[PDB]
Design a binder for this molecule. Structure first.
Ligand code: CLA
Ligand code: CLA
Ligand code: CLA
Ligand code: CLA
Ligand code: CLA
Ligand code: CLA
Ligand code: CLA
Ligand code: CLA
Ligand SMILES: CC1=C(/C=C/C(C)=C/C=C/C(C)=C/C=C/C=C(C)/C=C/C=C(C)/C=C/C2=C(C)CCCC2(C)C)C(C)(C)CCC1
Ligand SMILES: CC1=C(/C=C/C(C)=C/C=CC(/C)=C/C=C/C=C(C)/C=C/C=C(C)/C=C/C2=C(C)CCCC2(C)C)C(C)(C)CCC1
Ligand SMILES: CC1=C(C/C=C(\C)CCC[C@H](C)CCC[C@H](C)CCCC(C)C)C(=O)c2ccccc2C1=O
Lengths: 731, 52, 215, 35, 183, 99, 31
């Protein structure tokens, strides 16, 4: 009974809880016995190395499985008539019909059809054979081993970095902006110019011959002479065929804009040019902060100088540099917020602007990627706000931030929470009212009485980008406008050709249904933010619990006194916000999937007419697209969709199981377990066997965590199964 | 325990409708016995490790 | 004391009392209980003796020009059906192993039948035991090489040696069907001692909380 | 796929041998009294 | 003591105890004593390898043979597999012995002789002569590699080509001649 | 169109002259007002970061105005950036005017 | 040109070495 090596108090627990809490608090290094700041930072650094090695191993495994049991080589020849293979299937429980049903893409046996889009990405970056994939997997394997050795090395006393080294924010930002971001982008540009671009033109360029192949006919001379325009002489023709030399070109840094007519994706030359410009800008930005060369900036002085007069912002940003550098939770919250927003941006840009060849034609992959990134973004956003609350309850110092932006924003937290609640109430009241009004008028057979508000603002913005479907004739919609003439011979031709076409997702047509669903999304975001912000601002204390900060970030409650204090900690606020985040992401993914489902089948009228009322959402989307999924296996037989049907029921079961931990609380189970213990201690033969840990019911916080985990797992599994089965059984 | 544990797999195993079901089940019971064997060893090593 | 690589630091429990102690045990299989270590040594000696007998027989049959040793199982013609031979061998080996078990339980070493030490020539000593241990280890690797050469190559212990002598630069393991894998092993093993030295330099030799293979 | 026999050996090793060994070791370690 | 830059001072951690100490450390990498010792040994090792490499490249190019950057693509008595394996084993043993000798005595050496100084001739003047020659060799090897990358010619051939017409056969002229060479 | 030698040389010389005779006072004043980065009230070197020690090859230079070599590299970098921007823009023969 | 069996074996061996490095890092982190 001493497993929690990091917690002596937990080791003394004689119940099973000791094991439970021994695993849920293993990564909270700040709360471990005999923990200092230097050891904390060093442990985090080594953990980062381990995580990097894990990521490298995961990528290497994906590459190895695609090169060993996939059909990448066959898919290259026919990227539109062959389903990518993820990996093989070796399940002893499979029956003969199951083994025969899972054999698809010309495989020797049962396999899994890929849905992550790695085939399109690897095909777009220049990979063509299985040997290249195997080489990449081996290289990533060696890289992972190298990172593991680095993590072990930096844990030794001779290579242990000091705490001050971790606080050197200027040096770290300089190296990350100029090297981690700029140099990496420049190297990617080099790869695209040397491999991706030549490979897309039917010319193979590998390690064995990249030194004898010219990326451009006029090698390096125009670059050093300044005649950079010579690198965009003749781009790929509009009738170019990917992976071949018909209608090719010699340019390597173009800016046509739009999509490739055959692959329906962005031009490789455009992406190379983008990465080159990004690398230059990032390197320049990296040469900003002061290190040891007498030049640069001091973030502390910049923050102390950002104090507007008249005292509108109080002391301004005085002491913020130390508030961010000293607190790890503040940095983690900022990083999580930024990463989540970038994940959402990635999801929103990969479907409207496909970057990989033959990716827009893969309806299953596009939907899966969008949903995956949106769910990841939601979880990361919840984590960002949770860590912000942790910062307020564990690293915030009122004396060090007296009068700055933090103290002032905390001084009027009531106004913030009140306005968030008002916005949420308004959005909910009106969105639900309009939807119910439309449902009632639809039921009574009077669709003409529907309240269909035209999204004139979004349509106006779309017209500003070149869409002429709304008759606005604004900026890019007018050929004689200044912005239209400025880029007339640059990127506007392709951009307009792609935005005015209904065959792609570049700014889709919107109507009243989009208006209502967008307001529903605004509702979800506002309520989730309200819960998270209320929990972070009230983490230190409220009127019901003035000394909440003395009890930590997470605790069961404060007893039934003072009327009751159930779910009063900041952890509980994050817990309640996870449900809202799941609901918001569900609404977003439902909207995206239904709109694209109607677009792929050439029937936008279905969504344009059935999305204005909830019955259309439940009947024309959920019930209509669930026929093939629930038919994966039936008393007549089974097909390749049986795995998705089983996963569908599996998710439903996990979700319902979580409902138990969510509704039932600790009290009933404690008495039940006591009765069970009495039964075991009085049953003959079984008396010879004793328990090492006293069985007890799950903790209140532990129960909430288990219920939330079950709810989230069931939610994700159910939607993933439905999404893949619905978009895969049709296309 | 080992004798009473063959029957279930004999009459209900995945290969119950095959003449070689008896052998497969004998092996299955052997595996189950070995599993409950390691269970007994783990219980003994955890329960009996100190004196009082 | 010579180790399994120059300058190697043997484990704390591998002081050197046992014979053939080269400080080799990366998995720490016999670093917990001493009785288990004694049983492990007895098993090593038994495997070594069987390996020496097998290697001697395989080499003798090859030198007299007999067929492949791996194929000799089906080229034996004589009386006694296969089942009869199996039964006779099982019974005689059961009694022999029982006697060996009693010998180990009594004197702590091997024996032949009722004779606990079995040494008619009285050639027992600590110096003669080391010879048996080292010869057994060499014979074990020799038999492993015999099987590996029979699997990769289609030759025997003598034919493989002749093929290597004919063209040493082109008739080696790195040029066979398992050369690539072999190239990956050497390259790793070649850096294994040095890497261990790094652990003995940056981390030191202050033992470890766990063992690779506890058991 | 090359070496079709590998999955038939790796799948049971990762799903039956490795989990049983890991669970037994974890159970023996979380109840050691003196680690 | 002469410094790499007129008008400055040594970066404190460098005061002349090491051979070839010119106070050159703009980035301050040697701020750690143990790391400074390891870096000095690494500099000596890299310089020795570069010296041997440059000597071999020049010697082979004088006696004709193949280009230094194309010697690996030739045919030898043994394949690359066994060759790399034998070299890996030999170099692993040699480097292991060298590292072990450095742990006991923080100095260079060979096999089991640390330091490896047969016939004497070891003195402070020799220490700086080896460090400077090694640095020059590393710089020369980098020049060889980059020059070969731009112009597929050896070191001596490149020098002769430059001597034929230095104003139009240098590094600037090699960039314009890249399309004519590569392809 | 534009001579790379003349444009690059002129831009670099102009940037160096501006940073040595025009922008030097404001640059020095800003450097003195900002100073070296500090963590928890003390510089990174004072906190224990040995790698944060200012380089000695910039502490004092023989130039009467204190124009260090790092200053030369920074201004030369700006000059080259401007020169190549001019060369690249002049190399293109398209109409970017919004008229 | 599908990957051969020897390639899979080499990859598995390299993965074993990587796993050894990983377990070493984990042991160092536990300390
Ligand atoms: C040029 C020098 C340099 C470089 C290259 C790095 C690089 C790195 N450092 Mg480091 N560091 C440096 C200097 C440098 N550092 C210095 C001088 C200091 C002291 C001041 C530090 C102190 C330091 C600490 C304390 C830590 C790091 C960490 C890291 C790693 C960050 C995590 C990661 O891998 O994600 C990679 C990040 C990127 C690739 C950039 C992100 C770009 C966006 C967000 C992604 C989107 C791009 C694109 C769209 C993706 C498409 C790809 C898709 C097709 C798959 C990373 C490899 C962390 C670590 O993990 O430790 C191992 C960490 O803890 N550094
Ligand atoms: C870079 C990302 C990152 C990092 C480094 C951290 C780091 C940390 N977090 Mg944090 N967090 C993050 C993101 C991150 N978080 C995100 C995205 C969220 C939103 C979900 C949260 C929400 C969160 C909360 C609410 C809390 C922390 C806490 C903590 C601290 C302790 C964590 C711990 O105890 O480990 C323990 C690790 C676990 C218990 C693992 C959880 C088990 C998972 C959820 C179950 C998964 C089951 C699996 C999916 C089932 C598969 C299905 C299949 C079987 C069918 C720690 C410093 C805690 C803290 O700060 O203490 C005060 C705290 O209470 N985090
Ligand atoms: C379908 C289920 C559901 C519904 C409808 C709501 C609704 C609401 N939630 Mg909630 N939530 C839910 C599930 C739900 N939640 C779950 C499962 C969780 C996890 C436990 C949470 C956790 C949660 C938190 C933590 C918070 C909310 C908040 C809110 C309110 C946000 C304000 C708003 O949107 O204005 C719109 C209002 C509505 C849509 C309610 C409908 C109005 C009715 C229909 C009008 C009455 C007409 C008629 C007279 C009915 C009376 C008939 C009767 C007399 C017979 C809102 C009332 C936030 C809040 O309180 O905001 C300030 C808040 O902080 N929720
Ligand atoms: C679908 C969700 C769900 C599920 C599965 C359960 C399941 C259960 N509930 Mg429960 N309950 C739920 C929802 C759920 N509840 C909700 C939402 C509430 C709130 C009102 C409650 C409130 C509640 C109360 C108050 C009580 C229970 C009790 C029980 C247990 C009854 C014993 C039993 O059924 O025998 C067997 C268990 C099952 C049939 C569950 C499925 C298990 C499957 C069939 C076995 C699968 C084996 C597994 C896959 C193999 C291992 C694989 C390996 C990877 C681990 C049982 C485990 C009662 C109890 O404690 O037990 C007496 C009890 O008093 N529940
Ligand atoms: C994280 C990446 C990853 C993932 C998720 C998988 C997943 C899978 N692999 Mg695979 N593998 C990987 C990497 C990965 N592999 C790498 C890099 C290699 C190159 C050596 C292989 C080589 C390989 C072979 C030869 C085979 C599989 C097979 C399989 C399947 C059955 C698992 C099995 O028993 O094989 C065992 C897997 C291994 C022995 C090597 C995997 C080692 C990885 C890198 C461990 C990663 C651990 C992770 C980072 C830490 C997470 C913590 C977790 C352990 C709790 C399964 C779907 C089998 C199959 O094809 O099924 C039909 C099969 O025979 N894999
Ligand atoms: C994840 C890895 C994994 C693997 C590799 C297997 C493999 C197997 N399972 Mg299993 N299973 C698993 C997970 C796994 N399962 C999980 C997580 C669950 C809970 C949901 C189950 C629940 C389950 C059930 C209910 C049954 C199986 C059965 C089987 C066997 C299939 C039938 C057969 O081949 O005839 C027979 C198999 C053999 C003859 C070989 C097994 C005996 C070996 C040789 C042991 C050797 C020991 C020796 C006696 C000494 C097969 C060996 C069926 C079975 O037959 O039970 C064994 C069956 O009844 N599984
Ligand atoms: C970094 C040091 C170095 C390296 C890596 C090489 C590498 C190579 N040399 Mg070289 N060489 C070197 C130093 C080096 N040399 C020096 C300093 C000299 C001048 C004495 C020479 C003189 C030399 C000649 C004359 C030739 C080579 C040749 C070769 C190539 C084949 C060598 C061979 O067949 O192995 C032979 C292995 C041995 C002789 C045993 C080693 C004896 C030890 C070192 C004593 C090979 C790529 C041959 C070639 O093909 O030209 C390109 C060739 O003819 N070298
Ligand atoms: C970072 C180190 C570095 C240094 C110290 C220099 C230094 C110099 N460069 Mg150079 N350059 C560099 C990096 C560097 N460059 C890089 C990375 C590139 C690639 C973009 C270039 C590309 C480049 C070009 C294209 C040219 C120079 C030129 C010059 C010289 C300008 C002389 C002058 O002012 O003309 C005279 C002043 C007037 C006529 C007034 C000068 C000695 C120019 C030159 O060669 O001088 C003739 C020139 O044309 N550089
Ligand atoms: C001492 C002296 C003097 C002075 C002299 C001089 C003046 C010198 C110089 C020099 C120089 C002259 C310098 C400069 C520098 C720097 C530089 C030169 C840099 C750079 C670079 C860069 C950073 C670039 C980048 C890029 C790339 C790479 C690509 C494209 C894009 C870009 C452009 C961005 C006098 C006579 C007065 C007096 C006495 C003595
Ligand atoms: C609580 C807490 C925390 C956390 C927080 C968070 C989580 C935040 C966030 C947030 C977010 C999540 C945000 C976002 C954002 C965004 C923005 C702010 C934006 C914008 C805009 C603009 C400026 C734009 C413009 C433009 C352009 C550029 C072009 C096109 C057009 C347009 C208009 C679009 C911390 C720790 C820190 C502190 C303490 C506590
Ligand atoms: C069912 C239930 C129990 C009883 C549940 C118990 C006692 C846990 C039973 C779990 C058993 C031991 C099996 C574990 C199942 C998981 C598969 C274990 C996986 C965990 C590993 C990854 C460590 C509570 O104690 C409780 C307490 C407070 C609120 C709600 C509830 C509640 O709903």
């Amino acid at each position: 009974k001493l497993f929690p090596k990091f917690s002596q108090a937990l080791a003394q627990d004689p119940t099973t809880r000791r094991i439970w809490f021994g695993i849920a608090t293993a990564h909270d290094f700040e709360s471990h016995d005999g923990m200092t700041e230097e050891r904390l930072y060093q442990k985090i650094f080594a953990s980062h190395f381990g995580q990097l090695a894990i990521i490298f191993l995961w990528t290497s495994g994906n590459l190895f499985h695609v090169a060993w049991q996939g059909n990448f080589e066959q898919w290259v020849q026919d990227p539109l008539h062959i389903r990518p293979i993820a990996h093989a299937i070796w399940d002893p429980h499979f029956g003969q019909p199951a083994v025969e049903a899972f054999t698809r893409g010309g495989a020797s046996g049962p396999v899994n059809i890929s849905t992550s889009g790695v085939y399109q990405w690897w095909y777009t970056i220049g990979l063509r054979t299985n040997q290249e994939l195997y080489t990449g997997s081996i290289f990533l394997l060696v890289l992972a081993a190298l990172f593991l050795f680095a993590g072990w090395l930096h844990l030794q006393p001779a290579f242990q970095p000091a705490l001050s080294w971790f606080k050197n924010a200027e040096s770290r930002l300089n190296h990350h902006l100029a090297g981690l971001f700029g140099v990496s982008s420049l190297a990617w540009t080099g790869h695209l110019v040397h491999v991706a671009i030549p490979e897309s033109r039917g010319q193979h360029v590998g390690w064995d011959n990249f030194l004898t192949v010219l990326p451009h006919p006029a090698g390096l001379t125009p670059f050093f002479t300044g005649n950079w325009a010579a690198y965009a002489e003749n781009p790929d023709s509009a009738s170019h065929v990917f992976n071949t030399a018909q209608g090719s070109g010699t340019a390597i840094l173009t800016f046509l804009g739009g999509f490739h007519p055959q692959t329906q994706s962005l031009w490789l030359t455009d992406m190379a040019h983008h990465h080159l410009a990004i690398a230059v800008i990032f390197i320049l930005a990296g040469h900003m902060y002061r290190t040891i060369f007498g030049i640069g900036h001091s973030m502390r002085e910049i923050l102390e100088a950002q104090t507007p007069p008249s005292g509108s912002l109080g002391a301004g940003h005085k002491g913020l540099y130390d508030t961010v550098n000293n607190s790890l939770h503040f940095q983690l919250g900022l990083a999580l917020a930024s990463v989540g927003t970038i994940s959402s941006l990635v999801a929103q840009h990969m479907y409207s602007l496909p970057p990989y060849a033959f990716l827009a034609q893969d309806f299953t992959t596009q939907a899966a990627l969008y949903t995956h990134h949106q769910y990841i973004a939601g979880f990361i956003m919840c984590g960002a706000f949770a860590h912000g609350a942790i910062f307020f309850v564990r690293d915030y110092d009122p004396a060090q931030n007296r009068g700055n932006v933090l103290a002032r924003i905390l001084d009027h937290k009531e106004a913030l929470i009140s306005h968030l609640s008002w916005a949420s109430l308004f959005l909910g009241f009106h969105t639900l009212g309009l939807y119910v009004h439309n449902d009632v008028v639809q039921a009574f057979g009077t669709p003409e009485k529907q309240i269909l508000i035209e999204p004139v603002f979004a349509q106006w913005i779309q017209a500003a980008h070149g869409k002429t479907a709304y008759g606005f004739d604004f900026l890019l919609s007018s050929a004689t406008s200044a912005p239209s003439l400025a880029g007339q011979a640059l990127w506007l031709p392709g951009w307009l050709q792609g935005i005015n076409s209904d065959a792609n997702s570049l700014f889709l047509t919107i109507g009243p249904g989009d208006f209502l669903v967008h307001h529903a999304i605004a509702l979800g975001l506002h309520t989730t933010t309200l819960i998270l912000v209320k929990g972070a601002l009230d983490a230190r204390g409220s009127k019901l619990m003035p000394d909440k900060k003395d009890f930590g970030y997470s605790f069961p409650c404060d007893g039934p006194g003072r009327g009751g204090t159930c779910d009063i900690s900041a952890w509980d606020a994050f817990y309640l916000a996870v449900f809202w985040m799941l609901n918001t992401i569900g609404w977003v993914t439902f909207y995206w999937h239904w709109k694209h489902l109607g677009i792929w089948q050439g029937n936008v009228n279905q969504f344009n007419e059935s999305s204005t009322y909830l019955m259309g959402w439940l009947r024309d989307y959920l019930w209509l697209n669930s026929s093939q999924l629930i038919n994966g296996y039936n008393p007549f037989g089974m097909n390749s969709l049986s795995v998705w049907a089983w996963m569908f029921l599996f998710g439903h079961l996990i979700y319902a199981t979580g409902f138990m931990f969510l509704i039932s609380w600790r009290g009933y189970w404690q008495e039940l377990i006591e009765t069970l213990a009495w039964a075991h201690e009085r049953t003959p033969l079984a008396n010879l066997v004793r328990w090492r840990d006293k069985p007890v019911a799950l903790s209140i916080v532990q129960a909430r965590l288990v219920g939330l985990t079950h709810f989230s797992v069931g939610y994700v599994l159910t939607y993933a199964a439905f999404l893949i089965a619905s978009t895969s059984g049709k296309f | 325990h080992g004798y009473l544990l063959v029957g279930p797999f004999i009459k209900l195993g995945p290969l119950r409708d095959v003449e070689n079901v008896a052998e497969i089940v004998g092996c299955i019971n052997g595996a189950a016995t070995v599993l409950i064997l390691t269970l007994c060893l783990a219980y003994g090593a955890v329960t009996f490790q100190g004196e009082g | 004391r010579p180790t399994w690589y120059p300058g190697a630091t043997p484990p704390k429990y591998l002081d050197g009392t046992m014979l053939g102690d080269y400080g080799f045990d990366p998995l720490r299989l016999g670093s917990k209980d001493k009785d288990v270590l004694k049983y492990y040594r007895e098993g090593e000696l038994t495997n070594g003796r069987w390996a020496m007998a097998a290697v001697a027989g395989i080499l003798f049959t090859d030198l007299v020009g007999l067929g492949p040793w791996w194929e000799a199982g089906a080229k034996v013609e004589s009386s006694f059906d296969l089942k009869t031979l199996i039964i006779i061998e099982v019974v005689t080996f059961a009694i022999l192993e029982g006697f060996r078990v009693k010998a180990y339980e009594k004197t702590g070493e091997t024996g032949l039948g009722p004779f606990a030490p079995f040494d008619p020539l009285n050639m027992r000593s600590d110096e003669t035991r080391l010879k048996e241990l080292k010869n057994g280890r060499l014979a074990m690797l020799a038999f492993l090489g015999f099987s590996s050469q029979a699997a990769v190559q289609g030759k025997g212990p003598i034919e493989c040696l002749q093929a290597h002598l004919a063209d040493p630069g082109h008739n080696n393991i790195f040029t066979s069907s398992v050369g690539n894998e072999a190239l990956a092993a050497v390259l790793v093993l070649s850096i294994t001692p040095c890497l261990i030295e790094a652990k003995n330099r940056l981390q030191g030799t202050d033992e470890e909380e766990f063992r690779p293979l506890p058991w | 796929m090359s070496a079709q026999f590998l999955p038939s050996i790796l799948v049971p090793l990762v799903g039956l041998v490795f989990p049983a060994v890991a669970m037994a070791s974890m159970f023996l370690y979380i109840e050691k009294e003196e680690i | 003591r002469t410094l790499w830059l007129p008008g400055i001072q040594a970066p404190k951690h460098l005061d002349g105890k090491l051979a070839g100490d010119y106070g050159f450390d703009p980035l301050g990498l040697g701020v750690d004593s143990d790391r400074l010792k390891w870096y000095a040994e690494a500099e000596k090792t890299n310089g020795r390898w570069a010296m041997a490499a440059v000597a071999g490249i020049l010697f082979t190019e004088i006696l004709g043979k193949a280009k230094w950057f194309e010697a690996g693509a030739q045919e030898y008595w043994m394949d690359n597999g066994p060759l790399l394996a034998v070299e890996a084993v030999i170099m692993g043993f040699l480097e292991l012995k060298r590292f072990q000798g450095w742990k006991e005595t923080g100095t260079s050496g060979f096999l089991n002789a640390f330091p490896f100084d047969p016939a004497g001739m070891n003195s402070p003047s020799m220490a700086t002569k080896e460090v400077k020659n090694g640095r020059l060799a590393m710089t020369a090897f980098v020049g060889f590699a980059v020059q070969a990358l731009l112009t597929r010619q050896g070191p001596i051939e490149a020098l002769q080509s430059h001597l034929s017409s230095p104003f139009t056969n240098n590094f600037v002229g090699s960039i314009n001649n890249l399309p004519n060479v590569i392809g | 169109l534009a001579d790379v030698n003349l444009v690059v040389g002129g831009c670099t010389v102009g940037a160096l002259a501006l940073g040595r005779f025009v922008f030097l006072p404001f640059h020095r004043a800003s450097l003195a007002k900002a100073g070296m980065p500090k963590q928890n009230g003390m510089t990174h070197l004072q906190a224990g970061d040995a790698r944060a020690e200012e380089a000695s090859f910039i502490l004092k230079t023989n130039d009467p105005a204190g124009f260090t070599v790092v200053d030369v590299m920074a201004w030369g970098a700006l000059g080259h950036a401007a020169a190549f921007y001019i060369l690249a823009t002049s190399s293109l023969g398209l109409d970017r005017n919004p008229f | 040109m599908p990957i051969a069996d020897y390639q899979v074996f080499t990859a598995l061996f390299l993965a074993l070495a990587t796993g050894i490095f990983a377990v070493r890092l984990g042991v160092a982190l536990y300390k």
